[PDB]
Amino acid sequence: GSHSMRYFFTSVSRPGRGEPRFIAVGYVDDTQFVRFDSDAASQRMEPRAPWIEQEGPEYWDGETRKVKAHSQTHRVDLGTLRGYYNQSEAGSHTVQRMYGCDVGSDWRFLRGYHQYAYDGKDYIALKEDLRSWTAADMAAQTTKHKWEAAHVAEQLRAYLEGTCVEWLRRYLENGKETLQRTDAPKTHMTHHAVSDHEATLRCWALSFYPAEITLTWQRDGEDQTQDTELVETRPAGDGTFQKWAAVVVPSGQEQRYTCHVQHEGLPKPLTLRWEP
Amino acid sequence: SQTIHQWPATLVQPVGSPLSLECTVEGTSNPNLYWYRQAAGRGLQLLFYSVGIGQISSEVPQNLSASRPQDRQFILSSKKLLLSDSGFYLCAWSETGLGTGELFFGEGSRLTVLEDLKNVFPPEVAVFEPSEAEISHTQKATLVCLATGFYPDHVELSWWVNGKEVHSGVCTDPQPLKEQPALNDSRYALSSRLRVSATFWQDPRNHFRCQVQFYGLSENDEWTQDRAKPVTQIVSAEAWGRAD
Amino acid sequence: EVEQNSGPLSVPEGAIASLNCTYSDRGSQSFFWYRQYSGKSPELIMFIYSNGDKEDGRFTAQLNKASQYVSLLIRDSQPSDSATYLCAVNVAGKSTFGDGTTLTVKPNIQNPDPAVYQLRDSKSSDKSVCLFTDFDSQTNVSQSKDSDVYITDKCVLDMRSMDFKSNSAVAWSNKSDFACANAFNNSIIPEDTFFPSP
């Protein structure tokens, strides 16, 4: 399996209510492992998974120190940007940063990414080159010359090919119990009369990690069912994920359609068809 | 530098005095700011780290405090100095964020804390005229200056020719020596040499002066001793050209 | 923690000075050499963050993150490179410093002329001092062992104009029996004029 470490950062200005709300979260794959919240009484970076709790004081001190310096950058930028866009001091705006590193089955570096957003739109994105910047509008171009001048891309590259993939691997080891598990879908199926002419079959996949998965139907033909009601995969909130796909079928051909679940946790792709 | 100033530069103060050191910074906005100390060796210990205005972080517990009233004004203070607080206190700033991590430093504040100000003496200062041998054998002339009997161990020696500061043909000792290498509270000594061509020392309308800036007590310091008060002061000796 | 050797690390004028700095924290992410002339504040000479070499004039750093050191080589060392060299490592937004490496660049005296001279005080003829000058950078000077006698370590002039650099040392003492003849005794002395004119 490919793996990924991702840091997500959210700063919301709220003038007259004091300093901007700042929420940092760390993920490895689909497992959140740290968080910061400027509004919690801690003012520390804090664990959100068992395997990171085993790191010592210098790690928490450091992640706390770094995370606060990210939140301070964002404080300045809510100001600078409000300026660049000629917006008033009243009214609340959002800055979002995301960055991390992919690795493949070899745990070797694969890609790196670092993007910024103002008010839910792309502001500045590092390209896959880990060197070139894409800039949305005349304003992002100003940030672009600033960052090119100071070789921000070089610095991030260092982190992104260096520290990022190293500590990703260090987490994948320490947390082998959590992170390199593969919980297979527990799967049932449901029936529902819609008409005298039409039924509904639902393919349930519940209690699977990681969250990547494929639910697809067919019958009498390898070519799937073109059109299918499938829901966005959703966190069960215990650590696993859930998802169904469902299709509408003739009263006649109930037990003729079949559902095809694919998942790293499945030695071979599962296959199911209706039975009372 | 010009991006970061810091004062006062040098301080002699008894155990239990209060301390105020100020650091201005100009030409950047929203810097990180740092108080470093250098003592008992070279090598900087971080005292205070400040990610923004009013936000301070203490990195080791201590009888010192700091505050950042403005974006570009940082203060380090004590209510009561201990001996241990002796040191070279350095202010530094860093670009908003986690950039490269480059620290730009102020010119530092040197703090000597003493148990007993009765020990403090300014330097006695003599210049010695070149030897007639050196002049005939070398076609050259080495003036020597001798700052003796001073405590604590910090002065800055300078050479002045016809009332302008020469840097060329100077060597000063880069540390003073102990007059009583035995004691703790021994007084100290330091030499400098200025060398010139024999036919510049011989020009009798040439003025040679050795200046020694000493750092001692301030005007509002207690003094019980019969002798006048060993304050911050400049001590000089001098010599003129001699064509004989 | 960041470790660098205390000098004094002595290197001849023109040679390469090799300074080293180890560190233990796998959290470290950038690396710095500062130069601190005595009495003065550190000024940055090098920052590096990618494994490799980085050269600025006569300075080259080598970062190795695997072997966990960062080097500084000063090729063509001047005596004005004499200074204390501070290594610093960014662990987690905190620059931690080693206790520094002191470097003396011993100058190269092309036309040495060992001599011990006697200078007299301009204000009183009586008060007297011995200057031992013009020796070359292989000669060393030792602290006195006559309690009453005060000797300085050697000290490099530089008359940029005349094109001449002089090593010098100074002894003096508050006793009659003190002469220049045997003051810089207790040190290993070449073949120096002890001018018999005094």
């Binding site: 992640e63 300045v76 100071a150 | - | -």
Partner: peptide, 10 residues
């Protein structure tokens, strides 16, 4: 491990 590099004002 958070980046200690390349986190810079806009």
């Amino acid at each position: 491990n958070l980046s200690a590099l390349g986190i810079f004002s806009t």
